[PDB]
Design a protein around this ligand. Structure first.
Ligand SMILES: [Cl-]
Ligand SMILES: [Cl-]
Ligand SMILES: [Co+2]
Ligand SMILES: [Co+2]
Lengths: 416, 416, 415, 415
């Protein structure tokens, strides 16, 4: 009775099995069903972004192509029917599976499992998905939308820690209306940093106009903390006290429209013009991340004509650098890897149906603890080895992260 | 010779055994004895808080009920005879056991192992402990103080990392008197965040009076780092430059008296009234946490009459949010889980004796390294599996985190 | 030859097998076929409510979403082709199975809830998935073309022969339309409404209904109401006023009473210290025209000279009205239910539901003249076998809710 | 692996084991701990009443002797730490055990009576010993220091899931304090009071209560009263008189009504040939503030011009009032009980009672969202094993009442 773990990995519909590794905490086993009926735009094109390894209850994201095939338009997150953070404080993901097809009655599907973050993808062309990976069993090309594509999560490492889901804490009554405190994702964060040279800021074209300093790719998906010190010195005493504003912009795949903006400003006086420091210290909560963030933009703007010719050098107070750290970022599964499923040439106004199944190991919140029993995992000495071995000969056999649905169906019942 | 690990888990008095998992670093094995003779107040009531899984040398906390059964009065930390951080830089906890009884020759004991943090407990009533968990072998009710209760730590997961104890670093002589730098708990932090709505601050009743914005539950037990940006904008140019003060208060279970307070203030000038930002950046050392912290309180106060009617909106500069991250917080054992032992109807002025035993895997500090040999753990291939299996059938058998002392005594010598 | 019982449980289409438990009465075995071609509204949405364990001949109920997705509109009961109570007086349910698909674009959500219909929080297509955690008790986003199969997994054995509600022999001198029936009586479900020993909320106006209690409750067959809503007025009534107490029984939809019942008293000088309005009605089944899921107790008065007259409730004994329905707590009758929601179906299309039920029945005295009754086949290991498969129900994949194409294949293992 | 059930029966501290009988519904297993530190009165005497088989969360009741040994004074119910009806709708009791001793001089008598609390003739410390003859159902003069253990030996298997009395979802327009609950309904216990078809005893005076019947009866949860106390007067009432009928429910002690309920009629010229006072009340459970062990039906009138007016009873049909309590006849609920009397204890000392109960429960729809339900473990020989040990219960020494020090040792034979 060891094939239990692998069965859950391969046939998530089956239900949960405790993970037979070294992280044996007392827990609960729960299955989660996600149902999504998506509408296709005039273009009949779109991209489906899965986070097959994500412990959270945000497991995907749907994008559409505008009729002109010019860019993408974010539709919605793909979440779980149930908001897990209302009932549990901690969780690991045991196994997951997306079933993608059309529930109408024309159209095809490209699917590939990219072994990096969403922002690390060069292109999202329907055709360019096929070069996100070379592993034959990590992609599927031109599968009829009728027949369907199945997305299976093959463990991206074992012995992964219980992540803290982002539950809300007990409050006092004298609290602001709408204010709440939560115990957020903290463990093993992903940290990006923006490094500005010890030289002069590019000059503003005009007053009150934003001049960009850095733009680049980066992945934020939950609560983030920004720490930094963009410092500088002006060459001359400011004729008039001018206001330097520094904007950090977080945009998604689409439309350059900030998902979240944050600002820090200093006044350049006679008193400090030798070492002005604009300090970044913001903590961006998760409810603010209304769509996947894939790029950052650091810009600045000033306040006075008597400042535009005043050369500001950057290195003065210590390195000019702004960093941000997101919880759980580097936990395998959270941002990496992803599975892209692109659909094209679908009949407009039709429905692309996505059915999800997720199996977790969870730790009930103190309220549920009153009635719910917690148990150490079933005793499974060979369970993990068996999985290590099948994933080992994953290429000889044909174990896939991306399947042609009709195949996943048949070649699967070998695990019962 | 594999039962060695389990023997240490079940009979900590026996002594230490290296943990037979994947984290085989060169180490030392040491046993620690903690002796505590506590005095009972007039009320004959009190609560004992154990952190059975804690790697530190703070393993408990004693609270008393005031004669009126109104609230609790913090007594003291339960620590180890020896301050480990003076001799070692790194440690994991192998196994631990508290022995609680009366050393006088009337009274009972309730005990339950809660699978969350101290602040996540709804009530600390003697009777309400029994609904902190449903697992029969995680609680014990109405045990005579004479007979005693035994608290055993059942591993809350294996493969846990060597935490950094908080040692003091070599200094230079030209240093302040009393100033020191330490290498603190850093790994896998627990991070709480306070999310203020993008709306207006509640109005102060008067000048120099503190108006609360948020109060709630949160657990800090060692060094913490606060990062945030409580920003806002006033509706009108301030008639007079007013001083906004923001107080972050950390209180314990009792008496609302701040364990540690921290403040950040800005001046609202004509220059900045469109985007005032009060920045949180403090680093609260551990020696400042004089008692268990279980709740936070964010309040603000102003400076001028000409400001009380000046509506300050919050969303202006980016989300109004303050977060704090404590090292080791999410390392299993550090804050979760806890074991509560409540005593009531004890003869006042009597002594409740608590004897502790802890077994560690430690890494000697460079001074002790000169003379102390470090070794890889004994070779124990089946050691961990054996433990996984007993904890597996933990309910069939009767392996407990909370025992009736007389039972733990007998049913234990089966492990020699 | 023991797998007979389990075969019937898993493949009801097969036919009936006597239940191999301790309730061996002389009986008959009969299979029942139910055929339903339902029409979909403009909204292409709807909810299908099954009572997989019900001994009666009412085995389901169909609801539709109004084009606005605002609320539900009751369509009809799902009954058996044959009215069993015309031929039999007693019955247990051996096994049952619903086959749901389209006989013409659209999906299906299905979950087996382990409580009564009224105990369901929400009937959203998406909210069905959180009615149970048991993986094999739900199925999400199944194409209406492929179909969903609803299997009844025994909710306990040794369940008693319930009395179907047959009509009794009459005399000729009886009213036209009046009849007496031997109704469901055994192991009833009993709800009670408990009013505090304080004052009734004041009527806004004369002849206007002011509600006292509204809440959820499940009635599905004959009910008996017993109660004593008593009170006392603070002052002698200026004029003799008429207190009316309405007990309303509504369904999932539209607040329109399925059955209303009233009791009224006159507050005189004679009794104002202890007025008692007594509930005593017996609501027959033919009156339950659709599933009842909530109750509403309200009252109204008669005089202006009474609106300021504070009526306190505790006076005569607790102010409480209770009602008891026969068979209510027999497992299968009200609990558990299986919900199947359909959405995004082409309007004016047909959602076909085919049902199969196997009973153990006791023929009515007329059929007894010609029909032989027998003790069940001797099946010593029959019940244990079933207990064991349901035991490892999760290891294996035995379901109350199937993807039809799977139920088809994975089933022929039981022949 | 069959001894699982019996282990739970004998060592309830161990934890729950699904009951291996024919009532296999999908369920949950939960253990419940009850802790009670009782204070002894000046008399050092008292009686402990256990309901070892009760599915509810009311598992006992403590009485004290007044310093004069004249009568008893009710102290409190013995309940479970946790109110089960807030989390579960249905339950059976798997096994239970009380541990009774002093946590500080004194002795204990204990006997398991195989009937209801009201059916006990006397509660003398010494008279407990003649409540049963079965040697292993009683224990005499056990030191309070050493302690007495009360074990529940199954009083029958195949017992049905009783409905715990949960509160139902409400509407907001409801009275403040009013709620409706799904109460105990199954297999009720029904007492009836039968008044002869003769004349009511005459009132000594106006407005004075004259008793008609007093007797023993056991109510412990929600009750429904149905009746028709009818009569006819010999002469047209000189003045319209008000007949009041009081039904009183008292406990073991002090004659002070736990719950009173009244019904009254006016005797007019119009009806004096057949006056009927109708009983219709539904007494909720929150009203049963202490164990009820006796009923008292009395009546009082209103006029001098009525005291000589002979009222005969048989007129309208039998003069009879009945009441039916849910679950009453479910074994364990009212029968059997275990009495533990303590005497000669040091006043102001504490008699500590520790309880353990193991249930099979069905989570309420809210808990269903997250809690898995399972059919019981497959245990073919489990029940037989228990039937057999209880069979040779006398040869061996399996007890409902133990000397604690013995129960401790002779128990670990079941691990
Ligand atoms: Cl970390
Ligand atoms: Cl019944
Ligand atoms: Co390992
Ligand atoms: Co049987």
């Amino acid at each position: 009775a060891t094939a239990t773990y692998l069965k859950s990995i391969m046939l998530p519909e089956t239900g949960p099995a405790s993970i037979p590794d070294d992280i044996t905490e007392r827990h609960i086993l729960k299955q989660e069903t996600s149902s999504y009926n998506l509408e296709v735009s005039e273009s009949g094109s779109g991209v489906l972004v899965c986070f097959p390894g994500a412990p959270g209850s945000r497991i995907g994201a749907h994008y559409r192509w505008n009729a002109n095939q010019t860019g993408l338009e974010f539709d919605q997150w793909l979440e779980t029917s149930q908001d897990l953070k209302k009932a549990f404080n901690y969780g690991r993901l045991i196994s997951r599976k997306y079933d993608i097809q059309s529930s109408t009655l024309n159209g095809t599907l490209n699917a590939a499992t990219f072994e990096g973050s969403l922002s690390e993808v060069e292109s999202l062309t329907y055709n360019s998905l096929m070069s996100l990976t070379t592993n034959p069993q990590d992609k599927v090309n031109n599968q009829l939308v009728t027949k369907g594509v199945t997305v299976l999560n093959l463990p991206t490492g074992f012995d992964k820690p219980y992540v803290r889901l982002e539950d809300e804490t007990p409050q006092g009554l004298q609290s602001m209306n709408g204010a709440k405190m939560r115990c957020t994702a903290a463990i093993a964060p992903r940290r990006y940093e923006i490094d500005l040279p010890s030289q002069r800021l590019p000059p503003v074209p005009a007053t009150g106009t934003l001049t960009t300093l850095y733009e680049g790719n980066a992945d934020i998906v939950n609560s983030t903390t920004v720490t930094g010190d963009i410092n500088f010195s002006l060459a001359e005493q400011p004729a008039d006290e001018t206001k330097f504003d520094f904007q950090l912009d977080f945009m998604g795949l689409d439309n350059d429209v900030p998902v979240v903006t944050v600002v820090s400003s200093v006044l350049a006086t006679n008193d400090n013009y030798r070492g002005v420091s604009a300090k970044m210290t913001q903590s961006i909560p998760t409810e603010n991340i209304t769509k996947p963030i894939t790029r950052v933009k650091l810009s600045y703007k000033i306040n006075q004509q008597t400042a535009i010719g005043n050369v500001a050098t950057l290195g003065t107070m210590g390195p000019a650098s702004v960093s941000f750290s997101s919880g759980n970022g580097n936990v395998p599964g959270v941002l990496r890897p992803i599975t892209l499923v692109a659909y094209e040439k679908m009949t407009p106004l039709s429905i692309l149906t996505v059915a999800g199944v997720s199996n977790y190991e969870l730790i009930p919140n103190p309220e549920l603890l009153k009635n719910m029993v917690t148990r150490y995992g079933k005793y499974d000495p060979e369970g993990l080895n068996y999985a290590k071995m099948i994933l080992s000969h994953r290429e000889e056999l044909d174990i896939r992260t991306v399947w042609r649905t009709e195949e996943y169906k048949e070649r699967t019942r070998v695990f019962n």
